[PDB]
Every structure is written in structure tokens, then in C-alpha cells.
Amino acid sequence: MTKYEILYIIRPNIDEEAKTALVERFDAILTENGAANLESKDWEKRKLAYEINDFREGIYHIATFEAETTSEALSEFDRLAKINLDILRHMIVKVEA
Amino acid sequence: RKKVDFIAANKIEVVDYKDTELLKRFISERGKILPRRVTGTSAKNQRKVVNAIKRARVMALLPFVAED
Amino acid sequence: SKTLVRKNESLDDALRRFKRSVTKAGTLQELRKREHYEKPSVKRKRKSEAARKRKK
Amino acid sequence: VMTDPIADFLTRIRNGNMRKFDVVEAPASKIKRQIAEILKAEGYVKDVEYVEDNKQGVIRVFLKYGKNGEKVITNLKRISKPGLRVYVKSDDVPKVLNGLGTAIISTSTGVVTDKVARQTNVGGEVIAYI
Amino acid sequence: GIKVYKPTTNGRRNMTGSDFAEITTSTPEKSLLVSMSKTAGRNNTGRITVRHHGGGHKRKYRMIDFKRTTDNVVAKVATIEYDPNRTANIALIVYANGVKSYILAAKGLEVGMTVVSGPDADIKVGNALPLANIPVGTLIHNIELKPGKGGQLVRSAGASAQVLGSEGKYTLVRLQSGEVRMILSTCRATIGVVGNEQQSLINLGKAGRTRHMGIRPTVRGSVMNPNDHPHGGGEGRQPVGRKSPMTPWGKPALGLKTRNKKAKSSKLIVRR
Amino acid sequence: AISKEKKQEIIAQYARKEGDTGSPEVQIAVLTWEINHLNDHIKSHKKDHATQRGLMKKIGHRRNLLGYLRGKDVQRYRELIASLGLR
RNA sequence: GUAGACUUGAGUGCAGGAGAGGAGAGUGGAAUUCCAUGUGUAGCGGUGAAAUGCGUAGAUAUAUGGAGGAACACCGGUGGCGAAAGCGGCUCUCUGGCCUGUAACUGACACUGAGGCUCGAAAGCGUGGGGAGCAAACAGGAUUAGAUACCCUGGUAGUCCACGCCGUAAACGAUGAGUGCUAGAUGUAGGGAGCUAUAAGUUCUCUGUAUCGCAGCUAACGCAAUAAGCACUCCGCCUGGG
């Protein structure tokens, strides 16, 4: 019932054709859980100019999805977030908690 | 000369992490936080900001370690 | 981030920049107090009336 | 706790007179109405009034002072503690302060005074002296 | 997972119990045919050739999927059975084609997980991906330097394995004890975990039940003859000061390592 | 320890008077609900002894509960033993 | 005691927030030490100084990447939470406990608390790991009459992780639990309400935790609204010293 938020980053040199897949298999994770939002706005670069985890600038990705209640579907994600090589950093928080 | 907590200035509640430096002038020049004494903060409302600054310091949107 | 350099600094001017600003760095108190390790009940002797003596 | 409003109340009177102030408080019973009744009749307070609709109605009572808010009541205490319902005889009910003190006892008739408790051969529970 | 026996009698004093407690019921499958074999250590030559040994049973072994070179199928686990042989347990599997394939079991699998590789699959427990597909810092086994050739290497009864890294042709992998080989990167691999863990601490009282285990007992070298052993026998249980005691064969044993650094190896190493 | 739908639902079924959200029967409802909806969390890792003390004060709230609904009231629980039927 | 009634105590409802509350599941950086490593020379160590020592097998130091454990400076505070013990990188999981309002509702369900039960510092003890830095044990060098000590060089147990136990700590504030009463100057939280309006900034209310001090108060010291003041119910201790 709650909007979540997931912020991951990918190295910038990849293409848009990579980016569509690399958001839509998280559409696949939210369609196997099913607890998906309207659309995870999962690309919003603000800007990077600092090395947390050894990159000065990649491509931000901000998911921010509604889902079901406090159940398996939320914490299901990160086990399938670690698997991608392209992740630099992800983040997962509720609306205000 | 008021300049306390910035809370009445960004009144209210937003965000407190999706700024870049609008909330994050709470930074020091050395990547750490402004003092709660020099800033002179309202304690748990400072906690209402800093409880997501500690995120937003080290969320790879901000240099958490710096000098000068 | 680090500019390391005051605006067209000289030798004694950068010396006063590092003395003044790097004295307000806090870069020395936690080190000299981190000469040795202490008991955590002594870490709240640190977190005691030294700071309350500073403010109040 | 709530289990002694009697000595809670008399102790509160010692707060009012020892703190030399106007009004003390008491929830609504009948027994406390007899307390301020009998002792007002013996000249120690100056009001008999309580909150008009409450089973915990605040019996707020102006006191009877000396000459400068001066005390009249000094050794105020409940005799029979809640751990001890004091059950004395009727025939040799003792004097208080060699006569200089009050006495109030729930006898078989009612809750009557010192010498009325003495020579009427009525006996009950000792409550309070001064 | 270890129960106890109640100390009723002597010999039954400690008797650290099993807690099998987990394994599917009984009766392993009959077309799991592997013929039984006891060399009893002794060889083609057949004098003894290999030390203290012997006394088990007709240990009817069975074909596990040593290689698992199969592909992207509903590879259904059905049962996890007891192994007489090896420390971890085991599991039945049917593919689409109706076969009776069969794998080493793990810690927390269950019937119907049907886990498989193409190497299509992701990192969940029971996939035979190669480390060219597997990412960094994972917990695998069944990696053998010959591709198309199953378990000879550190697919390990006991605990499973881990992987530090990889580069180019090979893979920077620990095994245990601070050891790293660098294995050919497109050789197969089974992400997961060993079947059993606590089967390192079971203490069992009877010498004869260790004969039911099947090793005839081991002599000390001490009271043995000068004919027998370099422990030169004589008066008493005398000490041995004879420069680092050793085998009844002819090499010192404590200390020295015997690497054979002149190998088909040693460019696949760690510091130790 | 439940949402408003099963909260007010269990008030709705297990209330013997409408709007009596402080009924002893609704004390049985929420409290005798989260005894077994407390056991899920003690079996969650078997470590949170503070929640075990929550079970202490809620077992004691059950103790005042049926110690009172047997204590002063008697027969509106004697007809209502089969709410859960302890002991 | 028996029957009876009401909420006006308690709790349960509906709204608020809050926190290092617990327990798991993970992630990030700085920093230490080490693997190679640029390329160069005796260095570094420590104090009042050095021997300790290491190091020319030429290195520290400086160039980088890797490895691993630990812990997470300003945040951090007479701050909060938790009965305390205690709890602070970050994110989730299910998780108590209050307070503000509220009579919506039970109609005294209250307070306790021997017994019994649970939790619980700090070490250590069991099994199995993990093994950076620190450091019992011990060694070497000063030290002096002497040094089994303070200093230095090290350096084992041990510190950390799952997994069981002791039940004893200045347990402290050497101040039991419940609730009632009340001069004020005073902190700070987070609500409730007003409040100050063309953005400002004030007043009341509750639990919090100080500091001074009315009364009261003690042998004095001091306590004093989170009473060492005035009451009552549950418990407990205490009888001159060894």
C-alpha cells in the first residue's frame, strides 16, 4: 500500500538499449511479486561528482514504487539487486520510514 | 542573524534529502556537519533532519569526507 | 571540495590560513585525545561536563 | 494511593494549614462531610462544600485560622490506619491532651465526640485527635 | 544437529547421537545401479599396500550427477536420501524426459525446487553455472579444471566452497585454509552449500562400531620392533629422541611438505 | 498489534455490545488474539526478551482479564467459556 | 459480607508524534595492519634518553591496487528510549512501551508482591569459526638496592562471530514499589490547545531530565517536584566491632 524508493547507479558508458532492460527486469521483479507502482521512474540522474564506491559519475536510477504491505515483496528485491554487475549503489526506504 | 535550523526558511518538512546544498548547507567546509551549537539547534527537530542527513551524507550524492 | 589554497596566498598567508582554518578544523583534538585507547566509561567522562563547561 | 483518603485528607489539611493556605480538597463521601461537620462545629475549618455532581466531588473547604492565618490544628492525624480498624471499648475511652484535644469515634449510634463517646457508653472506631 | 544416547551402560558412556532427523524416509531407488567394490586397500599386487582399513558393508553406491552437463529443464528434486559413502546427503531429480538423475544435496533445498542451469539461471541454490557467469564473492562447489568433466576437485563433502575472484582465463577461488586455485573460467559450478555440516562432531564409543565404520585399528609405532619401525623398541615405553619420528616407510613426516612443485600446476596458486 | 480492519473486525464479532470497545470480551479479543499472534514473534528468533516482558504484562493483563470476568462477573463468562477456553 | 448503581482510577477505543527499544537480514566509507608494488636510501621506535629492537636480504617513507577483522569522529546533548543491564555507519523485517488529546466503553477490572519465574554487567568457561588492531601470560631493554611494576619493544590467553553457562559488579544516586499534597527561578522533548500575523513570536497543558532554592528537613553534609517534607498499602533489610 506504500510507495517505496530504490536508488541504484550504473556506470555511464552503457546505452539506452541497456537501460530499458536494466529497468524492465525490475519491472519483472515487480511483476513476479506483482506489487508494482504506476511506473518506477528508475533513471533520474541528478548529478554525480563523488566516489562513494569508486566512481565519479555514473547514471542514477530512482525506482520509487508502490507495492503491497510489509511482506515478502519489499525485501525480496535486494537479493536480486546484488546480482547485477551494473549496480554501483542501491537504496530502499518507505514513504517516511 | 536568526539563521537557526533553516526550518522556518524551508517551511516545512521537505525533503530533507533530495536537495543538493539547499538542505546541505548543514555541511561544514570539511564534509562534516555544521555544529548544533554554532547553528544552535532545536534538538529533536535537528534529529528530524539529521536522521536523513546521515543517509544523505553517504548516499553517493555528497562528499562525506573532505577538508578545507 | 578541497581548494587547499587561499585566494592568491603567500607563504605566511597560507600559514595563517592553515593555522586559523586548520586550527578550526578540529583535526588535532580527537587525535591527541586519540593518543591512547580508553574505557567506554571514560569515553563518557569525555562525554561529560567538558562539553557542558564549553557551552554552559 | 487511593486506599486512605482519610489520612490523605487530614495530611492535606496539614499541607493547607502548615503551608498556611486557604482551601484543601476531598472527594465526595459522607464520612468527610462528618469530618468537616464535626470539626467545623468544634471550630477548625470554615467551609462545608463539595462539587455538586460527582461521586469524587471535591469538598473544597476554607479553614478557620488564628489571627494572622495562624494555625489552630497542630497534631492532626488519623488514629486507625487502614491496616488496623481500631476497636476500643466504650467505658474508658481515654482523654486527649488532658482534655486539650479532639476525639471522634464511630460508635454503634454514630460518629460522636469525645465525652459523648465517654459517658454515653457508646463505642466504635477511633478516628482522629488533634 | 546432534542428539545423544542416554548413558545407560559403560561403553555407552557418551555416545553422541545422530540426529539424522531430516532425511527422506528410506529405500533408495533401485535403478541407481553402481556395482560394489572393496579393494581393502590391497592392489593388483595385493599384500596390504595401504594402511589400517576395512569392515564396512556391501555399500551399494549410486550415480550422483557428478557432471550435470544438462540444460535448462524442470530438474525436479523429489527426495533427499541418506548417503553411506560421503558426508553430505543426496537427492532424486526427474527431467522433462522422465529420467532418474540425482544430485548431492544442500543445506536448505526442498522437493520441487527443480533447480537447474543452462547457464541461464540466477544465483539461487543449485545452479551449475560457470564462474564466467557467476559474480564475485559467492559460495559454490563442483568446479573442476576439465570442462565437460565433473567432480574430482573441491566439490566437497563437509563444507561446500567459496570464490574470491576471477580474471581472464581463470578464477581466483579459495578452497579452505587460505588456499586459492585459479580455475578455467568457463568450467561448470554449482552455487550453494554442502548437505550436512555437523558430521564432523560425532563421538562413538565402541572400537567395534568404528569397525562398523570399517577401519581395522591403528597400531602405535612405539612398542613395535626394530624390525618394524624406526621407533627403536627396548626398555619400557621409552621416549623417542631419534630426530623427528616418521613412517614405517623411509621418509620423515612431520614438518616437511613434499610439494612436487615440478607439476602440471603451480601457476594456479595462493601464497601457501 | 493488528491493522484497523481486523482490529475493528474483531471488536465487531467479539463485542457483546455495540461501541463497547473496552469490553472484557474485547480484551479477550485483542489480548487473546495476540497471545498466538505473539507466539509468531517469540518464535521469530526466540531472542527479544523485551517482547517476552510484553508477554509478561499481557499474560498479566489476561490474568486481570479472566481473574475479573471470573472475579466479580462470573456467569457472563461461564456462558462464554468457549471464547478460547484457557487452562 | 450480601445484593445495587455511577465513572469519577485503571485499562481498552479513534488522532498525533517520538526515539541508540529489542531481534534478525543485508549494504557503504574512512582508518589500521598485511600481499605485490614505483624507486630511493638508513632509517624508524620510544622517552628525560637509549638499550629494547626491527631493518642494508636497501627497506621505512613514498606511488598503487588487493586482502581481511575491528569500530563507525562533527551526528552525540543534563538528549531520547529501555525496569535496569544497556542501546549510535546506513537500509529493510516484526517488535514492544509511553505521553498528548479523549468518556467511545468496561464499571474498580486497582496497587501490589513472600513463593516461584524471567532478564541481566564485566570477565571466564563449552563447541565451532574468524582471526586487523589491541592487549593477560611471558620474554627483552631501561629502572634502582632491586623490578616479577609504571615506559619501550614485542607478544600468548582473551577481546569479535553463531552457539550454551555462571548470577556475582560503586547494581550507584551506597537514595525500594504504588499513589496524594504543594513557594518559585529555572533546562529541553513532543504533542495538545490557543498564540503573534501582510512572513515574526508568545501563553497554558504532560510525561522527561538538570541547577538554585519556600516550607519541611537532618548529626551535619544536603534534599526539595524527577523531595533526604508531609501520608497510607506491598515488600524487603538493620542491630557494636573483628
Side-chain angles (χ1 to χ4, degrees), chain A, chain B, chain C residues 1-10 12 14-28 30 32-46 48 50-51 53-54, chain D, chain E, chain F:
Chain A
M1 78 291 200
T2 301
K3 177 63 72 177
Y4 294 149
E5 59 192 4
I6 291 172
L7 280 76
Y8 65 97
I9 300 169
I10 298 173
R11 193 270 312 277
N13 297 319
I14 49 94
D15 294 334
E16 293 179 352
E17 293 87 3
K19 290 197 288 185
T20 59
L22 288 170
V23 298
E24 80 196 2
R25 82 273 177 271
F26 289 164
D27 297 333
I29 200 173
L30 295 177
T31 198
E32 60 85 23
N33 283 322
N37 55 354
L38 65 165
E39 194 276 335
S40 295
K41 52 179 182 293
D42 203 1
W43 64 91
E44 175 61 31
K45 284 188 67 63
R46 302 184 70 191
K47 187 53 69 179
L48 271 169
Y50 180 69
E51 291 90 0
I52 296 299
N53 58 24
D54 71 8
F55 285 97
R56 79 285 302 145
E57 183 173 358
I59 297 169
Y60 289 105
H61 295 86
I62 299 174
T64 311
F65 70 101
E66 283 287 332
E68 204 263 331
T69 324
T70 300
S71 65
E72 197 274 336
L74 191 156
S75 62
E76 186 271 330
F77 182 79
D78 55 352
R79 186 189 59 83
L80 303 178
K82 293 181 181 180
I83 58 171
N84 186 7
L85 187 147
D86 295 325
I87 310 301
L88 274 65
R89 178 182 179 86
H90 63 277
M91 178 181 177
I92 179 162
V93 182
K94 290 183 175 179
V95 283
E96 61 187 3
Chain B
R1 291 184 182 273
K2 289 177 65 63
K3 60 184 178 292
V4 53
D5 291 332
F6 194 72
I7 290 173
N10 61 5
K11 189 186 290 183
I12 200 68
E13 185 65 30
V14 57
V15 185
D16 298 333
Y17 71 103
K18 286 184 177 180
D19 289 331
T20 60
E21 192 64 21
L22 193 276
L23 194 277
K24 266 67 67 176
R25 72 178 55 78
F26 288 158
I27 207 72
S28 64
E29 292 183 357
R30 298 183 173 88
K32 302 173 188 184
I33 197 166
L34 290 181
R36 74 185 184 276
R37 185 179 296 162
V38 174
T39 306
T41 59
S42 64
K44 284 176 66 69
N45 295 319
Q46 186 193 6
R47 294 182 183 178
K48 288 174 184 178
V49 187
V50 171
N51 278 317
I53 294 175
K54 293 183 181 181
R55 293 173 175 173
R57 288 293 165 91
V58 203
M59 282 304 171
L61 279 78
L62 193 277
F64 175 66
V65 58
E67 296 183 358
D68 290 330
Chain C
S1 178
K2 178 176 286 189
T3 179
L4 196 150
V5 167
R6 192 187 287 275
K7 273 74 68 177
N8 208 168
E9 63 188 2
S10 296
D12 294 330
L15 183 63
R16 288 186 294 274
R17 194 266 180 195
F18 291 151
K19 190 261 183 181
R20 184 181 176 91
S21 295
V22 296
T23 174
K24 199 59 71 71
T27 186
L28 191 145
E30 185 66 29
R32 296 289 295 170
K33 292 280 101 173
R34 200 182 283 120
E35 166 64 29
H36 64 281
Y37 185 73
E38 293 83 4
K39 289 183 74 170
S41 66
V42 189
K43 297 180 180 67
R44 57 185 171 180
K45 182 182 184 292
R46 304 289 301 277
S48 289
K53 192 68 177 293
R54 176 66 177 84
Chain D
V1 291
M2 61 185 74
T3 66
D4 197 358
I6 309 298
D8 193 1
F9 169 62
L10 296 173
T11 303
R12 184 56 182 86
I13 296 168
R14 294 182 293 172
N15 292 317
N17 196 3
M18 278 67 166
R19 281 181 175 89
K20 296 180 181 179
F21 292 148
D22 47 357
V23 177
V24 298
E25 70 274 16
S29 71
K30 296 182 285 184
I31 299 168
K32 291 178 175 183
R33 300 292 294 168
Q34 198 171 9
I35 293 171
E37 181 180 1
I38 294 296
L39 279 307
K40 189 174 181 181
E42 290 292 328
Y44 296 103
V45 298
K46 285 185 186 297
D47 193 1
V48 279
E49 195 275 337
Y50 56 99
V51 169
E52 292 83 4
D53 184 74
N54 191 0
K55 292 182 179 183
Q56 192 173 358
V58 178
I59 306 169
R60 66 104 181 89
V61 168
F62 297 94
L63 302 175
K64 186 175 180 183
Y65 294 94
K67 65 179 72 66
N68 290 318
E70 189 178 2
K71 67 179 181 181
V72 183
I73 309 165
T74 300
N75 293 318
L76 185 58
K77 84 283 287 177
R78 171 78 186 187
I79 306 300
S80 174
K81 71 171 183 176
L84 187 65
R85 294 290 188 269
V86 167
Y87 291 160
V88 303
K89 289 183 181 179
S90 67
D91 54 355
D92 287 331
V93 174
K95 64 178 74 175
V96 182
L97 301 181
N98 287 317
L100 301 172
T102 64
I104 186 69
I105 290 172
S106 179
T107 63
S108 293
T109 62
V111 187
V112 303
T113 68
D114 46 359
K115 190 176 180 181
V116 178
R118 289 176 185 174
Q119 61 187 357
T120 321
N121 204 4
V122 293
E125 183 177 2
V126 186
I127 289 172
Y129 297 164
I130 61 168
Chain E
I2 174 173
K3 60 179 176 64
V4 78
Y5 286 170
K6 298 293 181 68
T8 65
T9 67
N10 310 117
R12 297 287 178 183
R13 180 64 61 86
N14 193 4
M15 281 307 291
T16 61
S18 72
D19 280 335
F20 288 156
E22 187 271 337
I23 294 99
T24 59
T25 63
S26 66
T27 67
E29 197 273 334
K30 290 181 180 179
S31 72
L32 291 174
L33 53 97
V34 169
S35 65
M36 286 62 72
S37 296
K38 294 181 71 180
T39 76
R42 61 186 66 89
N43 198 348
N44 189 3
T45 64
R47 52 186 79 179
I48 277 305
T49 68
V50 162
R51 60 105 179 171
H52 314 283
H53 187 80
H57 291 290
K58 307 294 182 291
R59 186 174 289 178
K60 289 181 75 64
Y61 191 63
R62 73 283 301 160
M63 284 302 292
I64 79 104
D65 198 356
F66 297 97
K67 299 174 72 170
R68 193 171 63 175
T69 60
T70 60
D71 195 1
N72 64 15
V73 76
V74 178
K76 65 194 74 69
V77 41
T79 56
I80 38 100
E81 293 178 351
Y82 168 72
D83 193 8
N85 296 88
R86 301 155 67 189
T87 79
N89 280 315
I90 208 76
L92 189 274
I93 288 98
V94 181
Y95 294 168
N97 57 357
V99 294
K100 301 290 185 180
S101 55
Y102 197 71
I103 205 171
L104 304 171
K107 178 186 290 291
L109 58 87
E110 185 63 25
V111 48
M113 286 181 182
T114 71
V115 66
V116 78
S117 287
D120 55 353
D122 291 333
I123 205 66
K124 83 282 293 180
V125 177
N127 303 307
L129 270 64
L131 271 298
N133 200 359
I134 296 162
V136 177
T138 54
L139 280 306
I140 320 293
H141 61 283
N142 205 5
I143 301 100
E144 289 81 14
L145 69 98
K146 307 176 179 69
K149 178 63 63 66
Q152 296 178 358
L153 274 297
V154 195
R155 65 98 188 264
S156 294
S160 179
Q162 60 180 351
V163 169
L164 196 146
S166 296
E167 75 277 15
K169 191 70 173 292
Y170 301 105
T171 60
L172 201 290
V173 303
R174 302 170 71 189
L175 308 178
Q176 288 185 2
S177 69
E179 299 294 322
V180 170
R181 186 171 282 271
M182 286 81 78
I183 309 172
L184 196 145
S185 295
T186 179
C187 289
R188 291 290 180 174
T190 58
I191 168 74
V193 54
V194 72
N196 194 355
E197 173 64 31
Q198 72 271 13
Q199 198 53 254
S200 61
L201 56 156
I202 287 178
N203 301 325
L204 61 160
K206 178 167 65 78
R209 75 192 47 150
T210 66
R211 302 289 293 277
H212 293 298
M213 172 268 289
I215 290 171
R216 290 180 66 93
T218 294
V219 73
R220 294 180 292 114
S222 59
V223 75
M224 305 280 276
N225 280 317
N227 195 1
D228 301 334
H229 194 274
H231 300 165
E235 179 263 329
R237 52 185 290 164
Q238 78 264 17
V240 179
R242 273 78 51 87
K243 189 174 281 189
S244 300
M246 53 178 281
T247 171
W249 297 107
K251 288 178 287 299
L254 187 275
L256 71 155
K257 307 295 288 181
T258 68
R259 174 63 194 88
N260 191 7
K261 64 182 182 293
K262 280 79 61 180
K264 50 181 180 289
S265 291
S266 178
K267 58 187 76 172
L268 285 79
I269 47 93
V270 72
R271 280 80 55 198
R272 186 177 179 88
Chain F
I2 202 64
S3 178
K4 302 297 181 290
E5 50 181 359
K6 191 181 286 186
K7 175 70 184 295
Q8 303 296 317
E9 189 271 334
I10 202 168
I11 295 171
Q13 287 184 357
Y14 286 168
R16 306 283 74 75
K17 181 67 175 178
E18 298 177 355
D20 191 357
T21 56
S23 177
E25 186 68 23
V26 311
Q27 306 294 318
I28 298 167
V30 57
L31 191 68
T32 318
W33 179 258
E34 271 94 8
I35 54 167
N36 294 114
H37 195 72
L38 195 153
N39 288 316
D40 53 359
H41 184 77
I42 65 171
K43 292 178 179 65
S44 299
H45 301 93
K46 295 281 182 185
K47 294 298 178 69
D48 195 359
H49 305 293
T51 308
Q52 181 65 41
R53 188 172 180 266
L55 181 58
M56 295 299 169
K57 65 182 291 181
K58 284 184 278 293
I59 280 171
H61 191 71
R62 187 175 62 187
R63 185 76 171 173
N64 296 114
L65 168 54
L66 296 180
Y68 173 68
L69 201 60
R70 183 175 288 171
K72 192 186 291 289
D73 193 0
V74 174
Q75 290 302 112
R76 290 184 293 174
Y77 183 69
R78 179 62 177 174
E79 293 177 352
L80 275 67
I81 301 295
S83 300
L84 192 140
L86 291 178
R87 183 67 176 86

